[PDB]
Amino acid sequence: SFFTKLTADELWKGALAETGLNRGQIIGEGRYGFLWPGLNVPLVQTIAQRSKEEQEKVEADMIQQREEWDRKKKMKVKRERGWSGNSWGGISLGPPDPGPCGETYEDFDTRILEVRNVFTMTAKEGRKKSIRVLVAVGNGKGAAGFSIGKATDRMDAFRKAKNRAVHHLHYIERYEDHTIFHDISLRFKRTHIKMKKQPKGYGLRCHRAIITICRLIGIKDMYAKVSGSINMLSLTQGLFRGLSRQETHQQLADKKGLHVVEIREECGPLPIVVASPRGPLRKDPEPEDEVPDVKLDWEDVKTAQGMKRSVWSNLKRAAT
Amino acid sequence: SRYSPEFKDPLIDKEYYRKEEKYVRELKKTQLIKAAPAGKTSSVFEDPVISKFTNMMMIGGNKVLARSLMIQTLEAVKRKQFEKYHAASAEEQATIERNPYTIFHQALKNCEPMIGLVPILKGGRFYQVPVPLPDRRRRFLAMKWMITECRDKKHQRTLMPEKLSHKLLEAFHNQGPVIKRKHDLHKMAEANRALAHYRWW
Amino acid sequence: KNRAARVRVSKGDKPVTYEEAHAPHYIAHRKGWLSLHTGNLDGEDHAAERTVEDVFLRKFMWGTFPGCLADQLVLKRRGNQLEICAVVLRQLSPHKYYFLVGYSETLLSYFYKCPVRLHLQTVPSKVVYKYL
Amino acid sequence: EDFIKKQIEEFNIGKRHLANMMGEDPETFTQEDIDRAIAYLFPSGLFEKRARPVMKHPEQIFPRQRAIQWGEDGRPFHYLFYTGKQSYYSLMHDVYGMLLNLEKHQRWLIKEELEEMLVEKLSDLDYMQFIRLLEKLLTSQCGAAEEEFVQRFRRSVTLESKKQLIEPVQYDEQGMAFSKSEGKRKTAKAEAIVYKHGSGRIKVNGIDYQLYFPITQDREQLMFPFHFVDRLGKHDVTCTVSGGGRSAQAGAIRLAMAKALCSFVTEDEVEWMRQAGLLTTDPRVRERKKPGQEGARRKFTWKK
RNA sequence: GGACCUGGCGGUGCUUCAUAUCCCUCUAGAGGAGCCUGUUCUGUAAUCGAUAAACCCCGAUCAACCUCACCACCUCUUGCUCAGCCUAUAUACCGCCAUCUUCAGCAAACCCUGAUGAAGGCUACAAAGUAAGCGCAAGUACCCACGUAAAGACGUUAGGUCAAGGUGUAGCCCAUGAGGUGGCAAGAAAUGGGCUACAUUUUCUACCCCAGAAACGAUAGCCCUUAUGAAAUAAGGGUCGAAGGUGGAUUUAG
């Protein structure tokens, strides 16, 4: 009965059952086609009725528009893969949201690194799902920073994470804007990261997270082996600790009072002065400590002498 | 309660309302007095003990019946005491007392107990322990004992004024089942003397 | 819990008006009645067909003014003047509004056999009393 | 704000229209007349007086929007800006300074009222510390600026006087003096008339008290005021009563005699008799049965 | 496996309370008898749903037919309907509610702490918290500011109803749909809740509380009459003169 009919909001609420589609209609269309002057056609003042061929053509046009609307529901959207499909580690969120103090972050790229579904226990509800995300934001000029965003919604966690990262940025010194100054050995809690400066064209032979972070920073030619616990949140933090605690050539020259020179095998015996002291020059030479007391790494010595027999080390991979 | 807490009690005493407590009088004339109940009256024929005893004899809100029963009751008490006076001799007339209010009061004061028995659970078995009773509790106990003995159902066709008059005269002369049960309470306290250390208050 | 006419709080983004914001216990403490007919007053006989005509008119108006009535209607009934007061939005074309006004006018006139008056009020957007 | 300015302009033009609307083309249309006029124009019928229609000026309609605390250079105006509670902390500073210079020389506001005066949210303990500071200033012997400071922080008391309202003695009928009083208790209404002299004569509903009240409790209830005031066989009461039962009628009648003998007794004795509790209506009335219960407060069986 | 975080538990400690809820206490009842009415079980060819607190005079502010969806028998095919179905799924739902709640918490958006883990954020003589919004509160109704109502968020129990209606999924259309007539609601028994009693403060009569007289108890069974109805359940009168002697453990309410 017309009286026991009920609204579509209630009907779709009951049908979808999400709590535990009439836009393709003009105002005067019916199947009999008694088209009026006030509706459908505008206001000659003549009442009329269309023919059967016009009615069937109009309803065929309406139906084919309906299957067109169904197709424009079911296209396929292209999501760029991050480290794998159905993952989040290389997914590019957009530029960071513009700050309320007239601030724009347009050269800054944000990359997710880790999305975890994290539960806690509450007295009434039970298990309470909270998404914790970790993102890194950087522009390819040295400034980068990571942050954690925790929420009940993934989008809210993303937004919180990227805004807190642009408020917590670092700066990374680079040798010739392609690599680090030296080799950095750093243990952060239980994550040992061993990184080496590499010459141009070496590429980013690093852990996939390190590749994303160093693409956000601007570094291009580094080796990086991580060991111990490969925890994502400790990996990023230890990497940023080391990259912010680099010692540059100018600081080395000022500290030692000596010239800093480079000898490349590509050029030859030509000495290239890279960093000179900005003050006085120290005149007694550097003490040549014969048989120096340094702490070597057995993996490095194994690789140098060639007993590192592995079927995984120098494998042919894709670009960076 | 339909009274706000600022409403206080009304007090009715002519010796107080005829004349330290001067600031008490001032605060009382500045504070709110609630209305007087129906049972209390400014009269001085009345007894608060008698009124409470009527209110305890009341069943179902029949104050007219409770009053009528006490009417007939100490009416009969006065009648029988006058019979004793008329049938007595000189010194017996000198020693007999026929004021039913005084007989009622003295019967209740003879009927009231001085110690009580409270159950206390030490371990897993209940122990009846002696206890000091408050004055309100012992007066209520005496009056309830008299009423229960009147309604013991062993009286058959006897009427309530006759029952209460007979038990009242026995209680005044220090006999009867109410004095017997007070003595039995003291007997059972004597039985369990040494359990009195179980009290913590 | 009472779920009679109380819209629940989602998280803070739900536009809602005075009517369906207020709960049925404020029915004339704060809200008032949407339909004024004297049928439900103590001496009267015809209140049942008054009510079935009320629900008929409300569903008829919701169905023949499609997607333009902002919130619910004001159905007044004085003498034999039935008055339908509407709060309709400003999104269609005014010739269409006048067309449906006359249409509803004389349809309800010949259905309820009384002078029926459509009194319209146009609003730009759905009014928001609070956000729930 | 421009919102406030054009709202004030709209209110002025609207109240001008509204006075012209009703009857009042003269310029002086006061607020109570505005309320009466809008009450007639839109008959409210809503139980909430804030849900009733209103015509006030936008100062009272709109809340107090606090002004901008800094200009177009930063540089906030008050020196105590970065506390975030500039008015409260400036007040604390001023009272403390007034205590300091006073020492070197030698009812209360509520938290909501102080919040209104400061236009700042306040804590209970902050308000308590302010009150203790002002109490210290009052206990210290202070000068007139201090006194007017305490008095602009202090408000009125609105004390009530509680002498029983003495009904007038109307000298009427033939030559006799009387008072006509009323009483109500438990759905029973009793209006009584006491003449000063007559040695004690009661006329409940045209008959005597031993006929309308066969119960000695009811007769005692009638006796009660005369026996309290020691004027037993001196007056006469003719009373008519509607509704109730025997004790409700007796109590209502008693309240009527008490509230007329108040007129026929001295003021000290009527204060004494009010203290005795005869001039106050007993508000104890029958309660309501509830759905799902078996009486007013009595419930059904097993629930635990 | 080691160490934690949060929550729940503890026949877990200290301290402070509850007051008709915790005990001692106060009053009146249940559980013992009869009757009424639900439920279990048995029975019938004979609906369904509720079923610790939060079922058990519950859907029903109510079944002789009707209601009715049950059964028996006999009939209807574009069937009141551009059919319908009281077919299953309350673990798809909306709808309207119970319970904690005789609570005060829930919290968008931020910020900080924890080497940037799960998480956490307390000291007014103040050590990192700020808060829109919901709720309590406040404001309303009744006779007051008191009291009683109403109100009580997020969530808990996949808590109750696809049978109030709507409805997604699966099914039927010779059927599981539609109509007509007639029956279904009986106790070897048990149990929940009410009503009346077992009398003397009682019973009958007048009075509606100053008398007279006794010295008990079915609203059950049977008969007659009446009300309504097509067709008796209810009412009155007659008849009869049950069991019953104030009810253990336990328990309800104020």
Ligand SMILES: C[NH+](C)c1cc(NC(=O)CNC(C)(C)C)c(O)c2c1C[C@H]1C[C@H]3[C@H]([NH+](C)C)C(O)=C(C(N)=O)C(=O)[C@@]3(O)C(O)=C1C2=O
């Ligand atoms: C058997 N359990 C797993 C169960 C299953 C379902 N539903 C299904 O799995 C069926 N799903 C299909 C039919 C295939 C669609 C269920 O739907 C249910 C339940 C539990 C019951 C228990 C009910 C019970 N009462 C009715 C006797 C009970 O005592 C309680 C209780 N806590 O008091 C319940 O939890 C219970 O009422 C209930 O709600 C159940 C289910 O809902």
Ligand SMILES: [Mg+2]
């Ligand atoms: Mg894939």
Ligand SMILES: [Mg+2]
């Ligand atoms: Mg079920």
Ligand SMILES: [Mg+2]
């Ligand atoms: Mg069927």
Ligand SMILES: [Mg+2]
């Ligand atoms: Mg409830």
Ligand SMILES: [Mg+2]
């Ligand atoms: Mg309630």
Ligand SMILES: [Mg+2]
């Ligand atoms: Mg409230």
Ligand SMILES: [Mg+2]
């Ligand atoms: Mg369940």
